[PDB]
């Protein structure tokens, strides 16, 4: 239910191993950690979540766009990239959160779907 | 010495009246309040720090894309926009941050000129 | 070897119905139509061409952005999205033009794989 | 009534000294030659066109984003990107049309304004 998948437009390539760390607001007010993983070869990050654990809440995708870039020779702008938003309030979605980056820009957008 | 500026992809206007936080990060690792204001007309927020204030650090551009969205009808995605940067000083001297922004997608880039 | 990807950023899916034609520059210097099809309801459109026909040359991706947007209520402010590009012309590649669409602006990005 | 503005996602500055080639949908459906420039060292181009000159029609904005890559040593992707919209009187009198480069990628996006 929850994917991220993330683009390269200097290389015109996914961005290999960025890791990417998921957060949720908790009760307090506090960002709890919730998952996180490293794209894949496909820049995509599958298998952070289970609909099970995927509740209702506001999360925080937090791509770690600054040791992405500085692993390639260029020293970025951004110290990453975080998209927050409310999930599953009017029930249970899918969500892919993509992300275009370039070295002081960035692209963000959220696909989402009703099984 | 910091700019913002905001466009809005679904009506092709600036982004008026949003509001734009801008904290510094401190010693203890937490978010503090830096400057503050709403954009104007032409979607830019100007007079938010001075080059005395400035110093080199980490930044937090956060942009309530949520509200203005509300206030046109419209359901976003996003609860706000956030652009995290260091200011550098061997780096050019003038920050402007814009996003261009819709309702489930956002694109923001920095121009940073002297 | 070319297939096209279109999001829709007002409403957080994928563009489906989106007419797209592709052209290739000819000897005379005009485009010649090449390939077109329609994305289907992962805003997808494959099958456009085959590794035998998608020859070296300068390719142009159409993307009918302003029936799309027509057809949902919203007059749009670009004819369309155009997406012009070199292919093939260190070997075969594999292209992927990803357009993501508001009423607007558009962005585009392209992912080149060597198979 | 037209103005253009150009920036470079890779560098975080203005795109300085990019060829911009404007044409007008004509009788016979091509593409005539209406105006062009290279943008400024802050990444603009002014001075296009005039009101009197600027009517309602189908417009064409072409960026040399090609050359501009090669000049910098940066092998890109496009050909050069292309903005085709149509100019209307009823909407607002200013056409502002920007562009934000990076080697295989570009976003633009319209601010219209009164
Ligand atoms: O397989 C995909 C999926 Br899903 C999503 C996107 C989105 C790309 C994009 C972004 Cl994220 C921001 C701005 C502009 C763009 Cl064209 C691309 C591919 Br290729
Ligand atoms: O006056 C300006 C300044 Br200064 C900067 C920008 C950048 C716009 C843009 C962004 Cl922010 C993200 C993605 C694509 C785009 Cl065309 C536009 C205008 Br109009």
Redesign the pocket.
């Known amino acids: 239910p929850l994917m991220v998948?993330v683009?390269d437009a200097v290389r015109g390539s996914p961005a290999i191993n960025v890791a990417v760390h998921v957060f949720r607001k908790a009760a307090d007010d506090t960002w709890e950690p919730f998952a996180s993983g490293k794209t894949s070869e496909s820049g995509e990050l599958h298998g952070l979540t289970t609909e099970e654990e995927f509740v209702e809440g506001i999360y925080k995708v937090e791509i770690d766009t600054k040791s992405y870039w500085k692993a390639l020779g260029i020293s970025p702008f951004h110290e990453h990239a975080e998209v927050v938003f409310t999930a599953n309030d009017s029930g249970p979605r899918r969500y892919?959160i993509?992300?275009?980056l370039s070295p002081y820009s960035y692209?963000?957008?959220a696909?989402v779907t009703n099984p």
């Open positions: 998948k683009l892919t993509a992300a275009l692209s963000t957008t696909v």
